[PDB]
Ligand binder design. Sequence first.
Ligand code: HEC
Ligand code: HEC
Ligand code: HEC
Ligand code: NO2
Ligand code: NO2
Ligand code: NO2
Ligand code: CU
Ligand code: CU
Ligand code: CU
Ligand code: CU
Ligand code: CU
Ligand code: CU
Lengths: 456, 456, 456
Amino acid sequence: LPGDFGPPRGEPIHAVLTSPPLVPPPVNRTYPAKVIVELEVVEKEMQISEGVSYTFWTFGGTVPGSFIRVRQGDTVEFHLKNHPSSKMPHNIDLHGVTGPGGGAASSFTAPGHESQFTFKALNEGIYVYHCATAPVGMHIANGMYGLILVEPPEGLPKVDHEYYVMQGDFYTAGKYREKGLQPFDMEKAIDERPSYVLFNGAEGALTGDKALHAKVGETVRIFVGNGGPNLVSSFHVIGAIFDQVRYEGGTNVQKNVQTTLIPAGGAAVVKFTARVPGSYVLVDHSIFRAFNKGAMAILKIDGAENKLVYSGKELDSVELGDRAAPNMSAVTKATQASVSGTLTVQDQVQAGRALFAGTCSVCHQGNGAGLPGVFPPLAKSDFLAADPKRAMNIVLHGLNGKIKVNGQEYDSVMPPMTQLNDDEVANILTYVLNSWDNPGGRVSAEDVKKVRAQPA
Amino acid sequence: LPGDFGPPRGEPIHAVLTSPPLVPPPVNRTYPAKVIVELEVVEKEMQISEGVSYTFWTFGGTVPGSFIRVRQGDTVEFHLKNHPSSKMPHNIDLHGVTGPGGGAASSFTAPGHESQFTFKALNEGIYVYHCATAPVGMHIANGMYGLILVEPPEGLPKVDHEYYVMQGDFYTAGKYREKGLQPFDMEKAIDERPSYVLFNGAEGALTGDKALHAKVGETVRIFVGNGGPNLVSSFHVIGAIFDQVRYEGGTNVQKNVQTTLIPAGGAAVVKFTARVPGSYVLVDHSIFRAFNKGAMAILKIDGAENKLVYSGKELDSVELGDRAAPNMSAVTKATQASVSGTLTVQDQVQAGRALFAGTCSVCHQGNGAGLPGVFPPLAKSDFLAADPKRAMNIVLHGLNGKIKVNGQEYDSVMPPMTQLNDDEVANILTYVLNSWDNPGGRVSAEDVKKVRAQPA
Amino acid sequence: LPGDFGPPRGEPIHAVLTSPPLVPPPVNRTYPAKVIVELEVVEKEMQISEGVSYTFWTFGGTVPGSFIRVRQGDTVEFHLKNHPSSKMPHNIDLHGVTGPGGGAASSFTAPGHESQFTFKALNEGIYVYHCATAPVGMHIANGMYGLILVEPPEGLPKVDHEYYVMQGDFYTAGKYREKGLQPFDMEKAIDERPSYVLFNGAEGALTGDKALHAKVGETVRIFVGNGGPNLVSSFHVIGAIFDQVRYEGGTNVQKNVQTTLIPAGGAAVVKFTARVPGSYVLVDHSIFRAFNKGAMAILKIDGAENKLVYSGKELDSVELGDRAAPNMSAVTKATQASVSGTLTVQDQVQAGRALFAGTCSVCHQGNGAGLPGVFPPLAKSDFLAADPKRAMNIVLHGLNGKIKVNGQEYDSVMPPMTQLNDDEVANILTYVLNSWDNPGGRVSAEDVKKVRAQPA
Ligand code: HEC
Ligand code: HEC
Ligand code: HEC
Ligand SMILES: O=N[O-]
Ligand SMILES: O=N[O-]
Ligand SMILES: O=N[O-]
Ligand SMILES: [Cu+2]
Ligand SMILES: [Cu+2]
Ligand SMILES: [Cu+2]
Ligand SMILES: [Cu+2]
Ligand SMILES: [Cu+2]
Ligand SMILES: [Cu+2]
């Protein structure tokens, strides 16, 4: 058969699996081997967004699951353990496996059990693996997917960096950024109406202090999966071009494209050469996913400017919003303090500072100064101080028509921002009230809930 | 012009059209011909799912419509009849036709009439045809699509089997698996929110006893259409790889891929070589389509195991759910008995037996034994027998926390299953009650409707 | 670097930008230049459909924005002005730019300001540009996208015509064809549930008297963008085939395909050779977009028939519906008259005449004659005249079962048409009542609103 290089030789190899966004070393081998893969399913609560918990079902404790790297022609002895704390049974289907279910019917594993099966890796390429346990959609939606690379016999060309990025669509009972432990929502999942669309299992998984890194002149290979369960990614890099895009083990290689479609369950290898420094954004260019549901990752390039190629500046909160900053840990802290009943004004101020970036600063500026006669100030604002309840109604329901702020007329339009949750409005307004010589005090989530329930 | 090999020669040929999933023989001809195609539109009720009727609008009595096979350079004299029982007018647009509407304006046909037009098949490839009558979306949604193959002059390479598979999205007033004659739902169609996503016009059209067949070592070509009207298919084969994928008459051929995107209105030729026995699942890998809306088809391969390639087992209800079994004819029978007012306990038991597979057996086992201390038993269950109403509430609304069943503690989570219809819950629980030394009796759809309307 | 042909030579060039659907001339240059691009953002109300206003945000006063044409290796000095009448700040991200944000962070521009940045056009291809100002999705949804062509050094092959077509998804508070000034709807946008899907910013932007034109034997190149923000286009030409399809600056060229997937944010160059006369329809083959949300454009080919290739007729209202006619200006006029409180019967009759095409004429004929015993007449209809309120209920809610019209029995089905707005039903029925020896009078939108609120 194609990809059959005879029986395993050398010694059995225990596969080294890596957590996203890292990749195991190149196999660097000229002979087929028996490769033993041990992967454990863990069900666990993790933060899908700041102050938002979700019960993920994982291969190896992460979303996506542990990266597996083997060579075409290898005999793979696959061990699937299900942690005793699990409530559900699980299995695995690996794309690129030649056999019914890609392993599913020989990997069915109850909590506290282990299964094994063996396959020959006949098909070179990058492949999605996922759980295949009824109801399959629920298992994939909860995070049960990852990538397996089957290298060609001669290996992939050498690059400076290899990274592991996987998109998924997620379905919570609550709205986007609604705090608390969020249940899986079967109705949204069947309707293909996700609340979150993420790289690597969380908002901000690959932004700020968790960005991917390279230097000017270096090559970067990214193994890009789409776990779905339902969405097709218009996968794109802002401000750069892919030297190459190869899907699964396909013979076709596209070169010099910026935007590529990755099917649900699909995988691609992309290659990038870093030319000028700054932040390069990976997005799903179905744009509300990227900028309203979490589908943004950063590759930060360090090194010398080249003004002959690009004269301009690094991104900030205008483009990246509240993900320009290293993290939003203050939001997590304020949500934990609300639960404990120890929420301070300063907890709200720091959370609001984080959330004000982009969301409000695009028009009002990072210092609240606005732009005289165009965008009114929030700094030392008489209009704000005069009526904090009115300010709650402005954030939720918008504002238009002639107003006077700090002695100047404005005649413009502030769009409604109803998608902000009650805690987010409360924290942003508490931040503004405690900044820039404003009168202090605080707005509570309960205050905003009342205004939302009866607009002015 | 390209594809013009001069005037028709030989004798006029009456085209032999085939019903899905079969394909007409290769044209096996070295000269261009006059090919006469006769296709009749029939509007008729058929079962879209067990006990679920739908008024399909068809080309030739099937969804997809009759397969048409001609040679590049042929002169095609196309006759479209509209059966006198039809209520709507119809026409045809064939992709690959050079001319306005692909035939639409010269094929407009009232009930009881016939139209004809002639075209030269200049463009080799596989092409969708469909109705193009206002409102076009409603006509396509009701089933009016099929494939035309225009062979290259030398013919396609020989294979062991050729099959015809076409995806469609469907829009019923009722929910998925809600029984009765279901009207078309224009609102769901405009919103692109299908209730069913199917291969060949019905749930189970290509599963169980209707699976496609081949043997180890054989080649299979599948002509794959996407009628839409609205969805793009992440078309995938579980447990295998496509040797080749060619779209329409494109010059590009992708080789060695498992997952491919087929546009709405698009068509592809895929080729598969059978290597090891078992069930190979064709799916839309937008996974809730495949596992919650009907988008699964089976190619069953018979022949010798090859343990060096794959050591594992054939699929069962864990992966295929209630489509692992040859058919679900008991569901059809119980739905007909409910309508007639002759529904017996045994009718409910056999329907429930069919629906229990995967849906319940993944956790509770096919024999209801569960797994001591992990998944509680439904076999001889004291907890079930103690309160059948509570069991209805468990299926609809789920269960969590500590319980005692047959003297053993469980402390786990059963997800809600609200997407099951009242008749499905009633039949599954009647099956369980009449199995495994349980106390018998019955649950009615009306019993479940009351519990659904007021949870415990 | 690739695409670097040294410093600019010759004289600085002021780029000539074109409004859709036209393209600037080929650069026709053998040396790299300094190209100065001046583009102004304008926020303005325009008609998205007849009698439906929308506040678009534009690059250069149009949707899509002004077409930019440069040569690979050019140094581009990009000037972005924001008109003083603007309420929002804006910026630009050009795909194909090597640098963070594709220009976004160096083009941020308040109302009444100007920004500039310089880049080297290293990457040949066709590229989307768009606004990248928080909230990015809202800016793109309001129309802020266009195309930039970076020619290869030797230029593109010569063709007879070059056109500029760009798809977008739009999100109004009101339903499709609901009259008035329609606000942007953030909720529909986040849910990816557009009310309109358009080429070039309006229904009918490229139909009727605004169709694209060519002659038999000519070559046509179309630069096709997908601004999104959210949808992927199953981009298709009815009745023809693309000689070539190239995405962005990709090395891959597909040849001889009819249906291609364009990602959100993607762009392609397609080439068509005109073979036989008539209307060739560009659509998103996610068919409810094309036939229920506005996603249809026409290339009209003039010249000699070739009966050996295609024996049939030009399209009419069966396929193109109310877009077969040169325009629907009567709908705009009646909507303006309703607002002014000067709506005449004749205003309603002319609007209804426009809306009757396809919507009603597919079954009842353009002259209201129907087809004896199959489709009842609206011409001199006793049944219509007997009860105009019943006729309102028939349009909204459908009709089935045995009726008698003009002495003949019908036993058929007219589907409900609830998606028609109150003014559309009122105008269509006023047209019918004032035609074909019917009794005249008028139906008002308020009459239809009452019937819709309580069906018979
Ligand atoms: C531009 C798109 C804006 C964004 C984003 C936000 N605001 Fe705004 N705001 C904007 C305008 C043009 C106006 C004036 C409207 C008019 O009728 O002319 C406002 C007004 C306010 C006000 C009241 C006036 C003042 O005190 O300066 C407040 C309190 C306010 N805006 C707050 C605010 C916050 C907290 C934001 C993020 C959540 C925010 N705005 C975003 C323009 C824009
Ligand atoms: C795993 C994902 C399950 C599926 C699918 C179904 N059930 Fe279940 N069930 C499951 C658990 C873990 C439990 C115990 C929950 C706890 O609090 O620990 C249950 C419980 C029941 C019961 C009650 C107890 C008993 O009699 O054993 C019933 C009656 C029951 N389940 C029925 C049932 C049916 C009919 C199913 C398909 C429709 C079904 N379950 C699916 C786990 C899982
Ligand atoms: C075919 C798909 C139709 C379209 C589109 C429209 N109508 Fe219709 N109409 C149709 C049928 C088959 C029937 C008879 C139904 C039956 O029970 O047999 C009708 C009936 C009417 C009537 C009443 C009878 C008459 O006066 O002829 C009216 C007033 C009517 N239809 C109007 C009408 C209008 C205004 C339409 C566009 C908005 C329209 N119809 C579309 C079939 C079809
Ligand atoms: O390339 N911008 O999302
Ligand atoms: O390949 N699994 O759906
Ligand atoms: O090709 N028809 O939409
Ligand atoms: Cu699982
Ligand atoms: Cu899969
Ligand atoms: Cu039809
Ligand atoms: Cu079509
Ligand atoms: Cu903008
Ligand atoms: Cu972009």
